[PDB]
Every structure is written in structure tokens, then in C-alpha cells.
Amino acid sequence: YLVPQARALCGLDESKAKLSSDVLTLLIKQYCRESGVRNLQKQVEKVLRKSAYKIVSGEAESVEVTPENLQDFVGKPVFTVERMYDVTPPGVVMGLAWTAMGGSTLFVETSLRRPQDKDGSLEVTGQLGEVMKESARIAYTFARAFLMQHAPANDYLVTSHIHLHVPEGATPKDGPSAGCTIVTAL
Amino acid sequence: DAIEEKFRERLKELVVPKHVMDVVDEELSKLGLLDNHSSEFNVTRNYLDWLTSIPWGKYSNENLDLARAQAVLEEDHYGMEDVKKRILEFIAVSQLRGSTQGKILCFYGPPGVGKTSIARSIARALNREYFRFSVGGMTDVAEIKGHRRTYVGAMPGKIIQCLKKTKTENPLILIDEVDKIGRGYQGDPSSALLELLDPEQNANFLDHYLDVPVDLSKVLFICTANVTDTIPEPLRDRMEMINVSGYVAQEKLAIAERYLVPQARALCGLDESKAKLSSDVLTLLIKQYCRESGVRNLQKQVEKVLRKSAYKIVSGEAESVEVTPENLQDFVGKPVFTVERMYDVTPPGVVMGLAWTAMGGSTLFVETSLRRPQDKDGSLEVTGQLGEVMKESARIAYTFARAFLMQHAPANDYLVTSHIHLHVPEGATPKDGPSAGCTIVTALLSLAMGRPVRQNLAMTGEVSLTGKILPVGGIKEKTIAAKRAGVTCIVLPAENKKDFYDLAAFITEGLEVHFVEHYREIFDIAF
Amino acid sequence: DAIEEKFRERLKELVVPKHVMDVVDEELSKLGLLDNHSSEFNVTRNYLDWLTSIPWGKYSNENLDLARAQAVLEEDHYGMEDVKKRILEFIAVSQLRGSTQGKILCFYGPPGVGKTSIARSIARALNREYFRFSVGGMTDVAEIKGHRRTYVGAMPGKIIQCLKKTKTENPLILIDEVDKIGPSSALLELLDPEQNANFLDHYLDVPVDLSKVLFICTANVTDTIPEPLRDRMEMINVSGYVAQEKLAIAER
Ligand SMILES: Nc1ncnc2c1ncn2[C@@H]1O[C@H](COP(=O)(O)OP(=O)(O)O)[C@@H](O)[C@H]1O
Numbered sequence: 005y006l007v008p009q010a011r012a013l014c015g016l017d018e019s020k021a022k023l024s025s026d027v028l029t030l031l032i033k034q035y036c037r038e039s040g041v042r043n044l045q046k047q048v049e050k051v052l053r054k055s056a057y058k059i060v061s062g063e064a065e066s067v068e069v070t071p072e073n074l075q076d077f078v079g080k081p082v083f084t085v086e087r088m089y090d091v092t093p094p095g096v097v098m099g100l101a102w103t104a105m106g107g108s109t110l111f112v113e114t115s116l117r118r119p120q121d122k123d124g125s126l127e128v129t130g131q132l133g134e135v136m137k138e139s140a141r142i143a144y145t146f147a148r149a150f151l152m153q154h155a156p157a158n159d160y161l162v163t164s165h166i167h168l169h170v171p172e173g174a175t176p177k178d179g180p181s182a183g184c185t186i187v188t189a190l
Numbered sequence: 191d192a193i194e195e196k197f198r199e200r201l202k203e204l205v206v207p208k209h210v211m212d213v214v215d216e217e218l219s220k221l222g223l224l225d226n227h228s229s230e231f232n233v234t235r236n237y238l239d240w241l242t243s244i245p246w247g248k249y250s251n252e253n254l255d256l257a258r259a260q261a262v263l264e265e266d267h268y269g270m271e272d273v274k275k276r277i278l279e280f281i282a283v284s285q286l287r288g289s290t291q292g293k294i295l296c297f298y299g300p301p302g303v304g305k306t307s308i309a310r311s312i313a314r315a316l317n318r319e320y321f322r323f324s325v326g327g328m329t330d331v332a333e334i335k336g337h338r339r340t341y342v343g344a345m346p347g348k349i350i351q352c353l354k355k356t357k358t359e360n361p362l363i364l365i366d367e368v369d370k371i372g373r374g375y376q377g378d379p380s381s382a383l384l385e386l387l388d389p390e391q392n393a394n395f396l397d398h399y400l401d402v403p404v405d406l407s408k409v410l411f412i413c414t415a416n417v418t419d420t421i422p423e424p425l426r427d428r429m430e431m432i433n434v435s436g437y438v439a440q441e442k443l444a445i446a447e448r449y450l451v452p453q454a455r456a457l458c459g460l461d462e463s464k465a466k467l468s469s470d471v472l473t474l475l476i477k478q479y480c481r482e483s484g485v486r487n488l489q490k491q492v493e494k495v496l497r498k499s500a501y502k503i504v505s506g507e508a509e510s511v512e513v514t515p516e517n518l519q520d521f522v523g524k525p526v527f528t529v530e531r532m533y534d535v536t537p538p539g540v541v542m543g544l545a546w547t548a549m550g551g552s553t554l555f556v557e558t559s560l561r562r563p564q565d566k567d568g569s570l571e572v573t574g575q576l577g578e579v580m581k582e583s584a585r586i587a588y589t590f591a592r593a594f595l596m597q598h599a600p601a602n603d604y605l606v607t608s609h610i611h612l613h614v615p616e617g618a619t620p621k622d623g624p625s626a627g628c629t630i631v632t633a634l635l636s637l638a639m640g641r642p643v644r645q646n647l648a649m650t651g652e653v654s655l656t657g658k659i660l661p662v663g664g665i666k667e668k669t670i671a672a673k674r675a676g677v678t679c680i681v682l683p684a685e686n687k688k689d690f691y692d693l694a695a696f697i698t699e700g701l702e703v704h705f706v707e708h709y710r711e712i713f714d715i716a717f
Numbered sequence: 718d719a720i721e722e723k724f725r726e727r728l729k730e731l732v733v734p735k736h737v738m739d740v741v742d743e744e745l746s747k748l749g750l751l752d753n754h755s756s757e758f759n760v761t762r763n764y765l766d767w768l769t770s771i772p773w774g775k776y777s778n779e780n781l782d783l784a785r786a787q788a789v790l791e792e793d794h795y796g797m798e799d800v801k802k803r804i805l806e807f808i809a810v811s812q813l814r815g816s817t818q819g820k821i822l823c824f825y826g827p828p829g830v831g832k833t834s835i836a837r838s839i840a841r842a843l844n845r846e847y848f849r850f851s852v853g854g855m856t857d858v859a860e861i862k863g864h865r866r867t868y869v870g871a872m873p874g875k876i877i878q879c880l881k882k883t884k885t886e887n888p889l890i891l892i893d894e895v896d897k898i899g900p901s902s903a904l905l906e907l908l909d910p911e912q913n914a915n916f917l918d919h920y921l922d923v924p925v926d927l928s929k930v931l932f933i934c935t936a937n938v939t940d941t942i943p944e945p946l947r948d949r950m951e952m953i954n955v956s957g958y959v960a961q962e963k964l965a966i967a968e969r
């Protein structure tokens with residue numbers, strides 16, 4: 005629907021400007037992650053209008069769009085990194101989050117705050133909301149209980165001072181959906 | 191009566207659509223039945239006037255010459271490549287298709303960069319009619335939609351009057367300051383803009399006075415805003431966001447010596463033979479007085495110099511005067527931005543950072559000191575009007591610095607037990623953001639080891655709890671601020687390579703750029 | 718008719734721009750068919766009253782002479798050398814270009830230093846008309862931009878009121894306490910060289926040229942002034958007085 009109508013508006017035949025399924029897939033993946041259609045239409049129209057300018061100005065007789073030179077038409081990709089950790093060290097567990105620009109993944113990082121591994125504590129940073137901080141507290145309590153019943157000799161969680169961080173530091177996040185992820189990380 | 195023909199013979203040159211012609215006919219038939227001096231007669235007459243005044247099928251003689259358009263665009267504004275490219279693409283597309291087109295654009299950027307001014311130059315380039323529709327603080331929805339005929343003072347509204355007064359169906363409408371539209375209590379004008387700025391529904395824009403849809407698909411809508419975050423998302427999604435990035439010092443010099451100085455001389459009535467401003471004087475003025483992204487303050491400084499010279503000439507104090515970098519302070523006063531770098535040599539515990547500021551970016555330093563006299567557990571106090579995000583980043587940096595020193599030097603008990611105070615010496619101004627996490631880590635490690643970092647090294651980048659460096663924004667401003675100082679080496683996150691190399695060549699000529707993925711690389715670079 | 722001839726006699730000496738003339742002509746034609754008892758007749762009469770009262774082509778005869786203006790400035794106030802220098806520079810620029818000009822200034826300083834009295838003295842020296850209104854605590858945009866003809870209580874706002882009162886297109890307008898404003902978006906359009914020449918009022922529905930008006934703002938602290946508004950105007954510091962200066966002012 006979009007590309008034929010955009011061609012009819014810009015007046016470019018398929019032979020003069022090539023938009024393959026691969027370049028459209030890349031453009032959607034890297035520029036149009038939203039749930040709507042208007043921004044994808046705008047990107048397609050940008051590509052076609054730049055091809056039209058190249059044709060009219062005499063710079064080229066036909067314009068071919070490729071996944072390599074797409075950034076020449078639509079600039080740098082908005083989304084490039086899909087996951088922060090390729091291989092997760094022991095303290096971090098991968099989670100999932102809801103976002104307006106499609107789905108978004110999150111990680112939960114934990115590390116010792118004091119050298120020795122008298123109660124211990126959990127410091128929570130990462131712009132976590134009140135509900136999510138409460139879920140972190142519940143997760144800490146259940147992690148203590150579960151490690152108590154699974155490994156009685158392992159007093160790590162009760163004595164160690166632990167810092168919990170969700171490395172999307174500038175983006176606020178809330179919700180209890182991360183309780184099991186936090187338990188797994190701890 | 192002759193009023194009916196006075197209506198009819200001015201539709202001859204208009205290709206009126208059927209849905210308008212059948213309303214005009216019924217209104218004219220109603221007109222001939224009412225008494226010539228009744229109030230209903232006046233209402234019908236006013237409505238027929240409004241319907242007839244619309245340019246139903248006439249367009250301005252748009253020109254499609256790319257060379258002429260580029261010449262017209264270049265004669266007024268310097269270095270607005272994105273907007274000029276967008277307009278040339280518009281012209282090329284409108285040349286491929288056999289008819290005129292319309293688009294909805296939004297120019298956003300820092301104040302004083304030329305968003306409002308470029309619209310008139312674009313309208314002149316396109317040979318389109320120009321209308322400015324400032325919506326700053328507007329809370330009246332009736333200015334967009336109008337009022338029904340039943341009211342005594344009913345008028346269609348601003349847009350229909352634009353079509354009436356421009357006498358063309360494809361003008362250029364400048365909706366100035368769209369982000370500053372008012373949050374009216376009785377109505378929300380931004381919600382009425384959804385119908386006006388809908389790329390598909392422009393063809394059926396319904397006016398409350400006319401009660402007849404008008405085809406606004408051929409109108410080129412240009413909006414100006416300072417920040418996009420204030421515009422409602424349903425309206426922001428309809429408009430095409432294209433950015434004006436502001437001007438670097440070299441671009442400011444080009445604008446001043448090519449546009450600002452000639453126009454200011456014309457305003458002051460002077461000539462180059464009587465008042466001479468050399469490139470060195472303009473460069474010094476930009477460097478020491480006009481750090482803002484716009485060129486309005488630079489324009490004010492230039493006008494100040496020229497008016498001082500004009501007073502010196504008219505009063506007879508001098509036949510002619512030349513401005514020099516030595517005597518410039520006589521005209522503009524003593525320099526404002528006299529210092530670029532707080533520390534020429536950084537002692538142990540302080541690390542040079544970079545920050546985004548409205549004045550073309552600026553550098554910052556992170557200072558750490560031993561609050562209690564010993565090299566229970568340690569604590570970290572933070573000051574400097576740090577925001578909540580920046581304080582959280584400081585806590586993360588402290589935790590990771592402890593962890594890193596746990597493994598790099600297990601015998602080093604400094605960070606574990608010592609009580610540390612961390613400050614950013616710009617205490618009077620608020621600062622926020624996670625960009626300084628790696629700077630804080632470096633400051634803490636330099637304090638712990640007692641070893642100063644490289645003496646001309648700047649760095650930025652968010653840090654995770656495990657030490658991974660995350661991308662940050664404002665690379666251009668941070669790079670410019672680093673290059674103003676004697677920074678010979680800069681450290682950036684690896685994810686910022688793509689938008690660092692998108693910068694102009696002259697900005698990054700002399701910088702030894704290092705791209706990092708984990709802090710263990712920054713540690714080797716700095717130490 | 719008598720009303721039309723009265724409005725045209727109001728209009729004889731003004732050099733009216735073409736678009737304003739077309740608007741007045743069409744409104745007069747509209748008034749020529751409405752019945753006298755109609756409420757729309759009242760609205761049209763009230764509208765034409767404002768359009769025929771704007772001084773479209775009248776300028777005050779300024780005293781483009783450095784000596785007399787300097788004498789007036791130094792006889793009316795003591796120690797305001799920065800403001801006096803700025804006004805002398807303004808006069809020199811007006812003389813060199815050979816035409817009247819408008820500027821936007823801002824006097825900021827502690828209260829009681831003479832920011833309003835110096836503005837009255839400047840208007841006296843320049844032979845310009847003087848008008849002032851306060852924006853301190855203002856929260857209504859409609860008192861600057863006006864209300865359209867539809868509403869019963871519509872007024873054309875402070876700027877059009879000033880233009881009608883002063884009968885000149887180059888008066889001295891003092892905007893008092895710009896730093897205490899609540900509304901600033903109307904001022905951004907009011908004082909901006911790019912759009913001063915085409916200031917559109919909602920009631921008038923026709924643009925007026927404010928490029929020759931000399932705007933002088935008053936404040937006490939610059940930091941509280943809105944950021945986009947602080948960029949349009951020029952900041953001149955009217956600082957306080959030392960004991961010797963206060964003694965001289967008191968004696969003189
Ligand atoms: N690139 C440029 N070249 C020449 N003059 C410029 C340029 N950018 C801005 N100006 C001048 O600076 C002023 C900026 O005002 P304006 O266009 O209103 O900026 P904004 O739209 O950001 O408010 C204009 O009067 C314009 O003449």
C-alpha cells in the first residue's frame with residue numbers, strides 16, 4: 005500500500021527507483037519501530053524524493069537503494085543495538101519490558117558494594133518507580149528465603165551488601181513485571 | 191438584483207467543485223426570497239461573500255527552476271543545508287509530477303537560528319504566497335475553526351482568511367511557535383490542529399462558518415518550535431520533524447561577515463570606508479561574547495559596535511574609525527567568556543569532563559577529596575546541584591570504582607574505608623544526566639591511587655554497574671567544548687563512533703579520538 | 718452617509734497601506750447595507766472606529782540634535798551615563814540613516830534608581846509620545862493580542878490602545894516589570910524585529926507596523942525574565958547610587 009502510493013505521488017516508476025524487500029525490512033527494523041504507519045510512510049517518501057532529486061538534477065539516470073547506502077537517504081539508524089550483553093556474567097539476568105516503540109529488553113545487574121561476601125542491604129538505582137522498588141524488596145526477601153531453603157550454608161544474600169542496577173539509567177521504569185528477573189539476578 | 195451577478199461572474203475563473211456549487215446555488219436562491227433589508231438577508235450575503243472569496247481552483251505560478259531556487263535560498267541564509275535540501279527535493283518532486291503538491295513540515299531548534307526567517311525566503315523561492323500564523327499562547331479554538339453563522343460576529347477563522355487574502359489555493363502558511371500554543375480551559379486549539387495538519391484529511395477540512403470542506407492538500411504547512419517534547423504526540427506524528435542544529439564559530443563568522451555585518455551597516459547607514467570590521471575582530475567577538483547557538487546576540491554585538499562608531503563619526507570625534515582586537519573592549523566592553531579551562535594541570539583526584547550547555551557546550555571538572563583524615567565502611571558525599579539521575583550515576587560509579595579497585599589492586603583499601611567528598615565546581619548551576627559516570631569513576635580511581643590522569647584528556651560516557659560504557663548524547667557540543675580547551679585526546683563510547691564521524695572535518699582535525707566499550711580501556715588510556 | 722464621511726475624514730491625512738485600505742473599504746461597504754438598529758451594525762461601527770483611529774502614516778517629529786538632547790538628559794537626571802550614551806547613540810544612528818528607527822531596550826536594577834523617570838526624560842528628549850503599561854503578575858494573553866469581533870467584550874489590547882492614544886507610529890512604550898510576568902508568548906511576537914513590522918492583533922484582523930516604536934522594558938533581575946524574551950531585548954544596567962551620588966541627587 006505505502007510504496008505504490010508514494011511512487012504515484014512522486015511520479016517515480018519502479019525501474020527508476022528500486023526499493024526491494026530487504027531494504028524495506030532494514031528500514032522498518034532500524035527506523036520505524038513504532039506501532040504506527042505514518043513514520044514509515046515519511047521514511048519511504050524521503051527515500052523516493054531523494055531519488056527524484058537525484059534523477060531530476062542529472063546526477064544519475066536511475067537510483068538503486070541498497071542496505072549499504074540506505075543511511076545516505078534516511079540518515080543514521082535510530083535503533084542499532086538490540087541487547088546490551090552478548091554473554092551475561094553471573095550477576096546479570098536479561099528481562100523484558102513494554103515500550104511504545106515496540107518491545108524493549110532490559111537487564112538487571114547486581115554486584116557487591118563492600119568487599120566481604122549485621123544485616124546486608126540492597127541498594128536500588130536506575131530510576132525505578134515505587135511499585136518497581138517494592139517489587140525489588142519483595143524479590144530480595146524471597147531470594148533470601150529461597151537461597152536459605154535451597155543452600156542452607158550459603159549466607160551470601162543475608163550478609164552481603166548488594167547494589168542492584170537496571171542499566172537504562174536515564175529512562176524511568178516502573179512495574180512489578182521484573183520480580184522474577186530480580187530474583188534470578190540475586 | 192445585481193448582487194446575484196456580482197456573486198456569479200467572479201466564479202468564472204474558478205473551477206468550483208460540485209459540493210460547493212450546489213450550496214452556492216441554494217444560498218443564492220434563498221437570497222432572492224429574503225427581504226433586501228432583513229437580518230437573514232445580511233447573514234446570507236456575508237456567507238455568500240465568504241464562499242465566493244475562496245480561491246476554489248486557482249494556484250500561484252510556482253516556478254520549478256532548481257538553480258534559481260538555490261540562488262534565492264542562498265542569498266538570505268547561510269549553511270541551512272537540511273532545509274534547503276528538503277526544499278530542493280520538494281521542487282524536484284513537484285517537477286516530476288505535473289501538478290503542485292503540499293506538505294507539512296516542522297522546523298525545530300535553538301532560538302535565533304533562522305527557523306522563522308527561512309520561511310519567507312522559501313516562499314520567495316517557490317513564488318508562493320506567504321502567511322505567518324503565530325500560535326504562541328493562543329487559547330481560542332475559534333481562530334482555527336471559526337463560529338457558526340448564527341452568531342452576530344461570526345467569521346470563518348484564520349486559515350480561510352489566508353486563502354481569501356492570498357488569493358491562491360496553495361500558499362505557504364507559517365504556524366509560528368507551535369509548541370507554545372496555549373492550554374486553554376474552554377478549548378484546546380492543538381486538538382483542532384489535528385484536522386488542519388492531517389496529511390490525508392486536508393482535502394476535507396471543514397470550517398465551522400463555511401460548513402463546506404476546503405482542499406488544503408496543496409498548501410505547504412511549515413511549523414516552527416523550540417522543543418518537540420511539548421507538541422502533542424498525535425500532532426507531532428503528523429508533522430515532518432527536521433532539525434536546525436545551530437552554528438559553530440566558523441559558521442558564525444561566515445554569517446557575520448557575509449550577512450550580519452552588511453545588514454547592520456545598512457541599518458546604521460554606515461559604509462565600509464568609515465567603519466571597518468576585520469575578520470580578526472569578528473572572530474574575537476564571537477569567541478568571547480557570542481557563545482550562544484543563535485546569531486541574535488552576535489547581531490546585537492555587531493549593531494552595538496556599528497552604533498558606537500556612528501556616534502563617534504557624527505559627533506565629529508573622528509572622521510573614520512577602525513576596530514582592532516585591542517580596542518574592541520572600548521565598543522563592546524570587557525570580555526564575557528575570558529576563561530576556557532579551570533585546571534591547566536589536574537591534581538590527583540580531579541578529571542576533566544564534558545557537558546552539554548545552551549552556550550555551545552562547555553567542559554566540567556569532577557573534584558574528589560578526602561573528607562576525613564584516613565586513607566564501618568567508607569562513604570561518598572556529592573555536591574554541585576546534581577540531579578537525581580546524576581546522583582544515581584555517581585552511586586553506580588562509586589560501586590564500580592570499589593569493584594574495579596578490588597581486582598586491580600586488592601591491597602588498596604582506599605575506596606573501601608575512606609570517606610570521600612565529590613564535587614563539580616559549577617555549584618551555582620544545576621547539572622543532570624548520566625554522561626559523567628566514567629568521569630566520576632576516573633576521578634575516584636585517581637584519588638585512590640594518587641595518580642593524576644593525562645593532563646590534556648577529556649572524556650564522557652554513561653557507565654553500567656559492571657563497567658560497560660553506554661552511548662551518550664550531545665557529541666558535537668562536547669567535542670567543540672573539548673577543542674576550545676587544550677584537549678589533545680578525547681574518550682567516547684564505541685556506540686558514539688557513527689555520530690562522531692558525522693561531524694564536520696574541521697571540528698575533529700586535531701583530536702586523538704579513542705572509542706571504548708568497557709572501562710578497562712579508559713583505565714589504560716588515562717593511566 | 719454621515720458615518721461614512723466621518724470615517725473617511727478621519728482617514729484623509731493618513732498614508733494607509735493597500736491591504737488596510739481594502740479592509741476599510743469592504744467594511745464600509747458592509748456597513749452601507751446593514752440596518753442602523755442591527756447588532757452587527759454596532760460591531761462593524763466599533764471595528765471601523767478602531768481602524769480609522771490608528772495613525773497609519775503619522776510620525777512624531779523627533780529632535781535629531783545631539784546637543785539639545787544631551788542637555789535635556791543631563792538636566793533631568795544624574796549619573797545615568799550608560800542610558801544617556803545609549804540614547805545619544807540612538808540619535809546618532811537615526812541622524813546618519815536619515816530616518817526614524819525603533820529599538821527594544823531593557824533597564825534593570827534595584828528599585829528607586831530612576832528607570833521610569835529616565836524613560837520619561839528620554840521621551841521628552843526625543844519628542845516622542847509616551848505610554849506605559851505593566852505586565853507584572855499578568856496571566857491573560859488576551860490583553861495584548863485582543864479578542865476577535867465575535868465576543869461581546871472584545872478589546873484590541875494594550876498595544877492598539879497605545880497606538881490610538883498616542884496618534885503616532887513611533888512612540889516610546891514602557892513595559893514595566895517584565896521580570897514579574899506570569900502571557901510572554903504574546904510579548905515574543907510584540908517585540909521581535911522579524912515580525913514587528915507585521916504585528917497582527919486578533920481584534921483588528923489587520924497587521925500594524927511596530928518597527929519604528931521604541932520599546933523600553935523595566936525589571937529588577939534579569940534571571941527571572943523568560944529566556945526567549947531575554948534574547949529579543951537589550952539589557953542596560955541601571956545600578957544603584959553611592960552616598961555622594963545620592964547627596965547630589967537630593968541637593969539637585
Ligand atoms: N544562517 C543564517 N544566515 C543569515 N542570517 C541568519 C541565519 N540564521 C539566522 N539569521 C538571522 O538571525 C535572526 C534569527 O531570528 P529568527 O529567524 O526568528 O530565529 P528563530 O526562528 O530561531 O527565532 C534572523 O533575523 C536572521 O536574519
Ligand SMILES: Nc1ncnc2c1ncn2[C@@H]1O[C@H](COP(=O)(O)OP(=O)(O)O)[C@@H](O)[C@H]1O
Pocket residue numbers: 793794795796797827828829830831832833834835966
Ligand atoms: N540619578 C537620578 N537623578 C535624578 N533623579 C533621580 C535619580 N535617581 C532617582 N531619581 C528620582 O527617584 C524617583 C525614582 O522613581 P522611579 O524611577 O519610578 O522608581 P524606579 O527607579 O524603581 O522605577 C524618580 O522620581 C526620580 O526623580
Ligand SMILES: [Mg+2]
Pocket residue numbers: 305306307414
Ligand atoms: Mg522564531
Ligand SMILES: [Mg+2]
Pocket residue numbers: 832833834935
Ligand atoms: Mg519604575
